Subunit: 47 residues, 5 copies
């Protein structure tokens, strides 16, 4: 459904695997902060 992995890098950046893709970005600060919309895609498949 949602994320397969969700975890932090030691610099404070949030990482997530969603639909076999890897994303990173600063963690959301409120429910009005759409994280996936602004996260950087860093893995297109295989995760």
């Amino acid at each position: 459904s949602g994320f397969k992995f969700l975890f932090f890098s030691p610099d404070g950046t949030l990482y997530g695997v969603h639909n076999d893709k890897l994303y990173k970005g600063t963690p959301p600060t409120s429910d009005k902060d759409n994280w996936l919309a602004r996260a950087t895609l860093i893995g297109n498949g295989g995760w």
Copy 2:
């Protein structure tokens, strides 16, 4: 039932995914601490 993810950011904040929602807050100090009630909701759905 319980949490899907439960993990720390490097600044010491506890993060958790519960019923597809993302929460954060200082970790509970004791079993008198209703963490889910006081945690900040930072994502509603999709986690």
Copy 3:
């Protein structure tokens, strides 16, 4: 009978979810250290 989550806080404390309860304590240093018996309960239920 085992743990659902087992992870570190950035200050070096070990956290664990066991039997729906959340526990914390310094990590064990030898197999003679019964960690769960000495760990601090910081959440009863919902984890």
Copy 4:
């Protein structure tokens, strides 16, 4: 397929377990960055 574990060390190295094998490397920086292709194999079996 996919990863079983995917997590950071405090020095910023990404680690991953894929098909019983353990890999490490600097995290991928764009969707053109094939992480598993350049990651260092540090465990063949047992993970």
Copy 5:
């Protein structure tokens, strides 16, 4: 269940892992020849 159950770092850079209900720690492996479970410190036996 197969392989490890948990595999994760402490903030001082030590690798921890749960394997066959036992908890192990050690410096992370350095190559595909490094037999980690043979050299890792057993710090918990049962219940993990």
